[PDB]
Structure formats: C-alpha cells, structure tokens
Amino acid sequence: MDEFEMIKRNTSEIISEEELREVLKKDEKSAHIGFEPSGKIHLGHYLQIKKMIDLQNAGFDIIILLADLAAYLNQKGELDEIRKIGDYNKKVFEAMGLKAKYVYGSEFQLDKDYTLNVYRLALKTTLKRARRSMELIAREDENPKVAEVIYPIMQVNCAHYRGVDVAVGGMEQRKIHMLARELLPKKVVCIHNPVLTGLDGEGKMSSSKGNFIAVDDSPEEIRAKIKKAYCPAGVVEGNPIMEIAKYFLEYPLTIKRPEKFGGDLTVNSYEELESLFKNKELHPMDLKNAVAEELIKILEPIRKRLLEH
Amino acid sequence: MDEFEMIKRNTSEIISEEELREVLKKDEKSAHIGFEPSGKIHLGHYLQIKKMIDLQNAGFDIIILLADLAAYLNQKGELDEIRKIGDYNKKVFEAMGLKAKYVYGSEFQLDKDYTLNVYRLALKTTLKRARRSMELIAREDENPKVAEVIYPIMQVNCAHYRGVDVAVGGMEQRKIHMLARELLPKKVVCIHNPVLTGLDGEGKMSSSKGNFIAVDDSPEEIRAKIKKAYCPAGVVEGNPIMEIAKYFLEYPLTIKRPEKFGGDLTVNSYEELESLFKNKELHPMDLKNAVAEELIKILEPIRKRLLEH
Ligand SMILES: N[C@@H](Cc1ccc(O)c([N+](=O)[O-])c1)C(=O)O
Ligand SMILES: N[C@@H](Cc1ccc(O)c([N+](=O)[O-])c1)C(=O)O
Ligand SMILES: N[C@@H](Cc1ccc(O)c([N+](=O)[O-])c1)C(=O)O
Ligand SMILES: N[C@@H](Cc1ccc(O)c([N+](=O)[O-])c1)C(=O)O
Ligand code: NA
Ligand code: NA
Numbered sequence: 001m002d003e004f005e006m007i008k009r010n011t012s013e014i015i016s017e018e019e020l021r022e023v024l025k026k027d028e029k030s031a032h033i034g035f036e037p038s039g040k041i042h043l044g045h046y047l048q049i050k051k052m053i054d055l056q057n058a059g060f061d062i063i064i065l066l067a068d069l070a071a072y073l074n075q076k077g078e079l080d081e082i083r084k085i086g087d088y089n090k091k092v093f094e095a096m097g098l099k100a101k102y103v104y105g106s107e108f109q110l111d112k113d114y115t116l117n118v119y120r121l122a123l124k125t126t127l128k129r130a131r132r133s134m135e136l137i138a139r140e141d142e143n144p145k146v147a148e149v150i151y152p153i154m155q156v157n158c159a160h161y162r163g164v165d166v167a168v169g170g171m172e173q174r175k176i177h178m179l180a181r182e183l184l185p186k187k188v189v190c191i192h193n194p195v196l197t198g199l200d201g202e203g204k205m206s207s208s209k210g211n212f213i214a215v216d217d218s219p220e221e222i223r224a225k226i227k228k229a230y231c232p233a234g235v236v237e238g239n240p241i242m243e244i245a246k247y248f249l250e251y252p253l254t255i256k257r258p259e260k261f262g263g264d265l266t267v268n269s270y271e272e273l274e275s276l277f278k279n280k281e282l283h284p285m286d287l288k289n290a291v292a293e294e295l296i297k298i299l300e301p302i303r304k305r306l307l308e309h
Numbered sequence: 310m311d312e313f314e315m316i317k318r319n320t321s322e323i324i325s326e327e328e329l330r331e332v333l334k335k336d337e338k339s340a341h342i343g344f345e346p347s348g349k350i351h352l353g354h355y356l357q358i359k360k361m362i363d364l365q366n367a368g369f370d371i372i373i374l375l376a377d378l379a380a381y382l383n384q385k386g387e388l389d390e391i392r393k394i395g396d397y398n399k400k401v402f403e404a405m406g407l408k409a410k411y412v413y414g415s416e417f418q419l420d421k422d423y424t425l426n427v428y429r430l431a432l433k434t435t436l437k438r439a440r441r442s443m444e445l446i447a448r449e450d451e452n453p454k455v456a457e458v459i460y461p462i463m464q465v466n467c468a469h470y471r472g473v474d475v476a477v478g479g480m481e482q483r484k485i486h487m488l489a490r491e492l493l494p495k496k497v498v499c500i501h502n503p504v505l506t507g508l509d510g511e512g513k514m515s516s517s518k519g520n521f522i523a524v525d526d527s528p529e530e531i532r533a534k535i536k537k538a539y540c541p542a543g544v545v546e547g548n549p550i551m552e553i554a555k556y557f558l559e560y561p562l563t564i565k566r567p568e569k570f571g572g573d574l575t576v577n578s579y580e581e582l583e584s585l586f587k588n589k590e591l592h593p594m595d596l597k598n599a600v601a602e603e604l605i606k607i608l609e610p611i612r613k614r615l616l617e618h
Binding site for chain 2: 072073075110112116122124127130131143145147148149153
C-alpha cells in the first residue's frame with residue numbers, strides 16, 4: 001500500500017486523484033484543515049485528525065487552523081471565548097498524537113490584503129451559491145444573517161492565502177471547496193472524509209446535537225452511549241456502530257461472545273464483519289459489546305493524556 | 310429663517326428633527342455624505358452638495374466620502390480606475406464652491422478594527438434586510454452577489470467609525486440609514502434629499518440611465534435635453550422640469566414669453582409657479598425655455614471653472 005492509497009483509505013472523495021498524485025512527488029507539501037472550536041472533541045474530529053496523521057506520514061507539513069473568526073461568523077459566541085476553546089482543542093489534538101502547527105484564523109484573516117481579497121471573491125460569488133455552500137455548516141437560523149454568506153468566501157480565501165497544496169475536511173465542506181476550485185488561480189487538492197452518523201441514527205454526528213462519542217468520554221459513558229445506539233440487525237447503511245467498526249477499529253478483530261451464542265468470533269477485515277452482520281450472523285448486542293470495548297482501548301491513551309494535565 | 314429651517318429646506322425628511330435641533334447647539338459638529346464615484350456629475354449630485362453647503366453655513370464641518378470601496382462592491386470596476394474618477398468628482402465638487410475635506414473609503418475601510426466591526430454587524434443583519442436596503446442602490450444583476458449585502462453594513466459602519474453627527478444622502482439611502490440607527494449605539498441624524506426624476510419621466514435620474522443634466526453640460530446640450538423632456542401640461546408630479554424649477558432656480562423668477570402668448574411673467578415663489586402651471590396658465594414650452602436659460606446661468610460658473618483647468 002503506497003502513500004496515495006494510504007491517504008485515500010477511508011476517504012469519501014479526493015478532488016482530484018490526478019492532482020494529488022502530482023502533489024505527492026514534491027518534497028515540500030502542505031495540508032491543512034480548519035475546525036470551528038468545539039466544546040467537545042468527538043469521533044468525527046478524530047477521523048479527520050487520523051487523516052491528517054496519514055498525510056503527515058506521507059511527508060506533508062500539517063497545519064491545523066483553529067477557525068475562531070469562522071466560528072464567530074457562525075454564531076458560536078465571542079472571539080475571546082472561542083479562542084479559549086480553540087486552545088483546549090489544540091491540547092486534545094496533541095493528545096491524539098498529532099504533531100502539527102496550530103494557527104488561529106484571526107491571526108491573518110483580518111489583514112488588509114486578506115479582506116480585500118474576500119471582497120473581490122464576494123463580487124464573483126452569488127448569494128444563492130454561498131447559501132447553498134453553507135447548508136450543512138451554518139447554524140440553524142430562521143432569519144439567516146449576512147455573516148452566513150461571508151463565511152464561505154472567507155474559507156475560500158484561506159487556502160489561497162496560506163498557499164496550501166491540500167485542504168482536508170468532511171463532506172459537509174465540499175461545496176465550499178468546489179467554489180474555491182472554481183474561483184482561485186491555483187487549484188487546491190481537496191480530501192473529504194465521510195460524515196459519521198449520530199448515535200441515534202437520525203442525523204449526522206455533531207457537537208451541538210448531543211449524538212456523539214467524545215474522545216475523553218469515560219469507559220462507562222462509552223458503553224452506555226453504544227448500548228442505546230441505533231443498530232438494526234442486518235442494516236449497515238446509516239448504522240453508527242458499523243461506521244465505528246469501519247473507521248476506528250483494528251483488524252483482525254476478535255469479537256467475544258458467550259459459547260451459547262456462538263463463542264468468540266474472529267473477523268479479518270471490516271468487509272468480513274459487514275458480511276456477517278448483513279447475513280444476521282452477528283447480533284447487534286455482540287457487535288456493540290466488541291465496538292465499545294475496542295473503542296475504549298483506542299481512546300484510552302487520549303483520555304489518559306488529558307487526565308494527567 | 311433660522312439654521313434649522315435653512316437645513317430643512319427642500320429636504321424630504323430629517324430623522325429626526327429633535328435630534329438635529331440637539332446637534333445644532335454644539336460648537337463642533339460634523340456632517341458627511343458618500344458618493345460612489347461617477348463618470349458624470351449631475352443635478353442629483355448638485356442638489357446634495359447644495360445641502361452640504363447649507364450645513365457648512367450652519368457651522369458644520371463637511372466631509373465628502375469618495376466611496377471607492379463601496380463602488381467596487383457595487384460592480385463599478387477596478388479600485389484604481391474608480392479612485393481616478395473620485396479625484397475628478399472632487400474637482401467638480403470644488404468647482405461648485407464646496408469647501409470640504411475629501412476622504413477615500415479605502416483609506417480606513419480596510420483597517421482591522423473597521424473589518425471586525427463589519428463582521429459583528431453582519432451577525433446582526435439579516436440577508437433579507439440587507440437586500441431590501443439595497444433595492445434602489447445595487448447595480449442591476451440577475452444573479453445578485455455576496456458583495457451586494459456587504460455594501461450596506463459597510464456604509465452602516467462608516468458613520469459609526471468616523472464619528473459623524475449627521476449623515477446626508479438621497480432618499481435611496483434611507484433603508485441603510487435606518488439600519489444604522491437600529492444597530493449603532495450613537496444615533497446619527499439622517500438628512501434625506503429628494504430623488505430627482507429622469508428627463509424622460511420614466512425613472513429616477515441616474516448616471517447609468519442617460520436621463521440626467523450634467524453640471525458641465527454645454528448650453529446647447531442643456532437646451533436640447535430640456536426641450537425633449539417629459540413635461541405634461543398641468544402635471545407637476547413626476548415632472549422633471551418642475552423639479553428643476555423647485556430645487557435650483559432663484560425667485561422671484563421672470564419667465565419671458567412673447568406678447569402673443571401673454572408676455573413676460575414674474576413669479577415670486579415656486580409655489581406660485583406651481584399654481585400657474587397646474588391651472589394650465591403657463592405652457593410647457595415657456596416653462597422649459599425659462600428653466601433652460603436660468604439653469605444655464607446657474608451652472609455657468611461651474612462649467613467655466615472646469616473649462617479653465
Ligand atoms: N468550515 C470549517 C471551519 C474552517 C475550515 C477551513 C477554513 O479555512 C476556515 N476558515 O478559513 O475560516 C474555516 C468547519 O466547519 O469547522
Ligand atoms: N443542517 C445542520 C447543519 C449543522 C450541523 C451541525 C452543527 O453543529 C451545526 N452548528 O450548530 O453549527 C450546524 C443544522 O441543522 O444545523
Ligand atoms: N451609498 C452611497 C455611497 C456611500 C455613502 C456613504 C457611505 O458611508 C459609504 N460607504 O461607507 O462606503 C458609501 C451611494 O449610493 O453613492
Ligand atoms: N433599481 C435601480 C437602482 C439603481 C439606480 C441607478 C443606478 O445608477 C444604479 N447603478 O447602476 O448603480 C442602480 C436599478 O435599476 O439599477
Ligand atoms: Na530532495
Ligand atoms: Na463656544
């Protein structure tokens with residue numbers, strides 16, 4: 001498995017693979033991702049940091065944008081407070097093993113030249129396109145604000161300004177990224193990670209929807225959250241427990257079961273697990289028990305690093 | 310006629326008169342108006358500069374904003390070119406006798422603190438409200454751009470930033486001004502001048518609609534434009550020729566007519582003229598002849614100052 005395939009693994013899309021293959025030849029290459037600071041850092045965050053670690057192992061310099069000004073425009077509070085939560089998020093990412101450079105958006109996003117470019121992009125971006133780009137990002141608002149349409153052109157300008165080769169984010173970012181690839185002279189390679197389903201199966205996992213596992217959740221909390229989670233027998237689509245098994249667990253995987261239910265079961269790949277589960281040969285409760293215990297072990301070093309502060 | 314009434318004369322509205330009366334007591338008081346730079350300076354501009362001269366005579370320090378960055382956001386071209394047209398407009402205003410300070414918007418509107426405040430106002434302003442505020446300003450665009458909704462919050466921030474006591478503009482600005490009075494801690498007094506009708510009577514006089522008299526138009530050009538203008542007998546509403554008589558001409562006014570049509574006629578006020586014209590006692594052609602010749606004399610010193618450059 002070469003560098004390209006390592007980077008591609010468990011992504012939803014790469015825009016475009018040919019452009020990524022051209023970047024991979026350079027000696028010096030940079031990848032960045034931005035996060036609105038979040039009170040809790042959850043598995044959706046972790047999936048993305050894992051992808052940044054993969055890029056780092058492929059020779060990329062990693063930059064983590066603590067997107068304080070974007071969060072401000074998206075109604076997350078005052079800059080002062082947002083920045084404090086950003087510093088906490090930095091500590092969590094560091095505890096995940098990421099070695100990276102961290103920058104706050106407002107360190108450069110209020111520069112005269114940055115702003116001037118935002119206004120030039122504003123002349124090229126329709127209101128309809130900007131609003132469409134924000135459908136999966138913008139905070140719920142019955143009376144959408146002008147800030148909502150500044151946000152995307154701010155993010156477009158960010159990759160242009162910083163000179164990054166690769167931008168990474170969840171699929172919720174893909175319309176902003178395709179706007180950037182249309183408007184900017186240098187085309188940035190975009191790597192989009194899948195959006196995890198919330199534990200109740202009803203929407204996407206989100207810090208604001210209370211449907212997440214946080215990386216520093218206690219073992220008991222993780223067991224309770226998974227016990228209650230949506231997980232229909234034979235159903236993989238939209239099944240948060242199967243997503244966790246696909247994106248976080250190490251294989252071959254031994255699923256412990258009582259002898260009266262088949263005894264311990266060893267699966268060599270996620271695809272094998274998927275066949276077992278689809279064939280109703282693996283019961284949700286045993287899948288849940290394995291996913292909970294393996295996820296606890298995966299998160300343990302992160303939780304422990306945060307606990308010793 | 311005191312300072313308040315001099316300022317009020319020929320305005321459409323003052324928001325509010327009580328606030329203006331409080332400003333008038335101060336020793337130091339400032340009034341400003343902004344103009345997107347315009348290739349031609351027309352009677353609509355002149356009406357407003359006349360109002361700035363009235364404020365100047367009432368003890369106000371006058372600032373003329375050459376609104377280069379606003380014009381840029383409203384699709385009037387590149388900043389470089391817009392700024393050149395701004396310097397020409399300054400020369401025209403000076404030729405009208407205005408003594409004032411001139412500032413380009415971009416001298417301060419790209420400051421970090423200015424921008425930060427724009428983004429704070431963006432959080433408080435709905436997209437619907439911003440678009441409504443721009444209905445009579447925004448350049449025609451079948452696909453409205455994000456720039457269109459940045460523009461008004463930029464203008465709101467301008468009066469707040471510069472610390473002006475009074476903002477002056479045409480009635481087309483009134484929704485932006487009422488947004489500013491809602492969002493800003495210090496309430497700015499707003500003085501709105503009437504919108505002149507275009508010469509063909511079909512819309513408002515505009516530099517982009519080719520329906521204007523420019524202050525530096527030749528006498529022959531002024532005569533031809535007025536000869537062709539909408540001017541129905543007995544109709545005052547929407548009659549550009551009667552508007553010119555109301556807002557630019559000095560009274561008492563002697564209207565020369567052939568003896569076979571009544572001979573020379575002297576009117577002591579615009580209201581007298583209005584009664585004559587409504588009663589079909591003054592024919593459009595004689596009104597036009599008088600308005601053309603008196604307007605030529607009014608504009609003559611401006612045209613001559615510009616010609617001797
Ligand atoms: N849109 C990202 C945050 C973000 C990512 C990348 C960026 O460049 C910026 N930005 O520029 O402000 C912001 C999120 O949903 O969390
Ligand atoms: N359509 C989603 C977009 C969204 C998802 C998750 C979120 O955390 C936020 N948000 O609050 O910024 C917004 C919503 O209902 O809001
Ligand atoms: N809206 C004005 C121009 C303008 C007036 C006042 C202002 O403060 C600003 N501005 O801030 O950019 C711009 C026009 O239609 O010509
Ligand atoms: N509703 C008017 C608003 C407007 C009037 C005059 C103008 O010069 C401009 N303009 O081009 O900026 C715009 C229009 O049809 O455009
Ligand atoms: Na090398
Ligand atoms: Na005094």
